[PDB]
Amino acid sequence: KFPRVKNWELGSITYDTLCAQSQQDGPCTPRRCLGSLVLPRKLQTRPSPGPPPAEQLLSQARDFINQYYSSIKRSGSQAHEERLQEVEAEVASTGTYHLRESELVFGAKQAWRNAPRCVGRIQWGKLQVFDARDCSSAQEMFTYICNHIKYATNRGNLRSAITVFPQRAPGRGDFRIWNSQLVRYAGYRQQDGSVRGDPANVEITELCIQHGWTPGNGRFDVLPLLLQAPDEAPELFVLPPELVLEVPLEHPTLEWFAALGLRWYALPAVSNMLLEIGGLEFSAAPFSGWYMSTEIGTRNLCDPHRYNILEDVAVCMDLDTRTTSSLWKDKAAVEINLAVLHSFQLAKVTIVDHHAATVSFMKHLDNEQKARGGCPADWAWIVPPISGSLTPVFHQEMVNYILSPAFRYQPDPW
């Protein structure tokens, strides 16, 4: 059936009919809901040593091709019919097929548009697509990645972009970017288990060292990239410092904040997810946009398993950390988020606060309701990590399901 979706702040109601177009199962069942789980048990994306079932692939390919021609208002046209025949021909003889650049561009934008966990989707139509499918080495991957970064950064005036490397091929190894993001701060394990830097990057930091990287000893050492060409050991590449724009954090009124020596990079670029389009899989397709302040100020800096700076800022603010009821944690967190926004604005680097971002998502939901009869969204990820109910999305019911094209998680290459 079609779910009734209500917004409790406004009392408005809609019905999601788009979910009926989903062809991939999620983790839930009538007996129990697993919507709060981060990763799949296996929904992932298993190996590719053998060719995907011709029937299945062809079914997905046709669907995508149909989606494409519908987007250009040329459905049923001569081109549409012949393109479909081309794909069938290629699959029947080779067990796979290839996308035309225009189809790739449309597919990438749709994958972003369909990502249920992305609150910035109102920007889905504005995405610069770099075709890197004519890449045959790790060195070439590095060149493409540097160009992506320079373009995406644009001196602080961030522009959303994605670079697409060669699709996966049967029996052959994948092109892969080992790092989870193009910019990551090192996490060094020492002495008594503690960690200097970012605890989230301990494993990747160690891998780089093992592969020849001369480690530093700071809290914010930008890591090198481990790029891997098919069936070859990954190679190490150091990003030119002038390409990695960073923002020193300072507070608008608290003079001592800057003394904390905190900072964060301007460009958020995901590099470990897989882009699936019409059955084809792109194991290396880094995409980037701009940060929403809470990602840095709340999660990256305040998570207990991350930089965990909450108590330090609290002590500097001379707050009463003796008890939970003083809400010192809440107070410290707000100022940290403020410092991030202030600093990025001062540095003239694009960023959006959680209020503005959620307000735009609500508009996006409305645009999509009229455009496709619904919009897949993951409530737990859409609602900000702080001030949840202070934002409109908290009061908005959502329907979560999987549509394709899609960005999916994939196994670590090591």
Ligand X SMILES: C[C@H](O)[C@H](O)[C@H]1CNc2nc(N)[nH]c(=O)c2N1
Ligand Y SMILES: CCS/C(N)=N\c1ccccc1
Minimum CB distance to a copy of itself smaller for 214 or for 324? 324
Q: What count of Cα atoms within 13 Å lies in the side-chain half-sphere of residue 200?
A: 17
297: its two tokens: 């100020």
According to CB under 6 A, which one of 115, 284, 301, 362 is a site residue for ligand HEM? 115
The strand pair at 161-164 and 128-131 is best described as: parallel
| Site map 321..350 versus ligand HEM, x via CB under 6 A | ------------------------------
- Token digits of residue 129: 């697509």
Using CB under 6 A, which residues numbered 268 to 287 contact ligand Y? 268, 270, 287
Q: Judge contact between 226 and 211, C-beta under 8 A.
A: yes
| 289 counts as binding ligand HEM under rule CB under 6 A | yes
| φ, ψ (nearest 5 deg) of residue 334 | -60, -45
295, 311, 312, 397: which one binds ligand Y (CB under 6 A): 295
For Cα atoms 332, 335, 339, give the angle at the middle one, nearest 5 degrees.
135
Output the smallest distance, CB 377 to ligand X, in A. Answer: 11
Letters for 311-330 (x = contact with a copy of itself by CB under 8 A, - = none) are: -------------xxxx-xx
From 164, 302, 349, 406, residue interacting with a copy of itself (rule: CB under 8 A): 302
Q: Does 387 bind a copy of itself (CB under 8 A)?
A: yes
Q: Which of 29, 30, 38, 55 binds ligand X (CB under 6 A)?
A: 38
Q: Which of 295, 299, 306, 316 is catalytic?
A: 295
Ligand-binding annotation for 400, yes or no, is no
Tokens read off for 368: 């999509």
Shortest separation between residue 357's beta carbon and ligand HEM, angstroms: 6
Applying CB under 8 A, which part among 18-26, 54-62, 85-93, 236-244 lies near a copy of itself? Answer: 18-26
Rounded CA separation 108/161 (Å): 10
Element (H, E) at 207: helix 202-210
Q: Is 17 in the site for a copy of itself (CB under 8 A)?
A: no
Residue 209's identity, in one-letter code, is I
Binding segment for ligand X among 91-99, 147-155, 163-171, 395-403 (CB under 6 A)? 395-403
> Is there a catalytic annotation at residue 302?
no
* Cα–Cα distance for residue pair 155/130, rounded to 1 Å: 19
Report the C-alpha gap between 371 and 215 in whole angstroms.
Answer: 50
Does 405 bind ligand HEM (CB under 6 A)? Our answer is: no
H helices present in 95-201, as ranges: 101-114, 138-153
Tell me if 216 sits within 8 A of 241, measured CB to CB. no
Q: 206 catalytic, yes or no? A: no
Q: How far is 59 from 43, CA to CA, in rounded Å?
A: 19
> Which entry of ligand HEM, ligand X, Zn ion, none binds 35, CB below 5 to 8 A by partner kind?
Zn ion
Q: Are 395 and 309 in contact (CB under 8 A)?
A: no
Q: Give the torsion sign (CA, 326, 329, 330, 334).
A: positive
Asked if 286 touches ligand HEM (CB under 6 A), the answer is no
Residue 361 in contact with ligand Y, rule: CB under 6 A = no
For residue 352, the 8-state DSSP code is B
- The C-alpha atoms of residue 246 and residue 249 are separated, in whole angstroms, by 10
- 201 marked as part of a ligand binding site: no
303 interacts with ligand Y by CB under 6 A: no
Q: How many CA atoms lie within 13 A of 146 on its CB side?
A: 14
Among residues 83, 103, 113, 118, the one annotated as catalytic is 118
- The answer to whether 38 and 382 are in contact (CB under 8 A) is no
- Which residues 193-232 are close enough to bind Zn ion by CB under 5 A? none
Q: Which of 213, 381, 402, 413 binds ligand X (CB under 6 A)?
A: 381
Determine whether the annotation assigns residue 300 to a binding site.
yes
Residue 146 counted as an annotated binding residue:
no
Residues of each annotated binding site for L-arginine? 181, 290-291, 295, 300
- Which stretches of the chain bind ligand Y, using CB under 6 A? 268, 270, 287-289, 291-292, 295
Residues of each annotated binding site? 28, 33, 36, 118, 181, 290-291, 295, 300, 380-381, 394, 409
- Catalytic residue numbers, as ranges: 118, 121, 290, 295
